[PDB]
Amino acid sequence: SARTCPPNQFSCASGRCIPISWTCDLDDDCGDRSDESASCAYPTCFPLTQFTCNNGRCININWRCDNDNDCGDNSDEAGCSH
């Protein structure tokens, strides 16, 4: 069989099925092992919904939450995030 999943999604390690948007995003799934970086080659981490953490890092663009300024000298918050 194909065991690669439709183009709208992707197949994890053992030919499973996970949504395309789960690969290179920030969450460690299992495309290759965690489909993070070692899959899409990480072109500037992810040019979809990204914010730049501590001195040029890449975090979720929607990590604001508190409505103030996140990463820069310290992390975004690590409070209301998760």
Partner 1 sequence: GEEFRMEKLNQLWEKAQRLHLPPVRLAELHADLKIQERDELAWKKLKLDGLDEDGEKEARLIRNLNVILAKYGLDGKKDAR
CA–CA dist 15, 65 (Å, integer): 36
| Residue 46 identity | F
Q: Whose CA is closest to 23, among 36, 7, 32?
A: 36
For partner 1, the binding residues in 46-75 under the rule CB under 8 A are 53-54, 57-59, 66, 68, 71, 74-75
**Least distance to Ca ion from the beta carbon of 77, Å?**
4
The reply on whether position 80 binds partner 1 by CB under 8 A is yes
Q: How far apart are CA 16 and CA 11, in angstroms?
A: 5
List residues binding partner 1 (CB under 8 A).
12, 16, 18, 27-30, 53-54, 57-59, 66, 68, 71, 74-75, 77-80
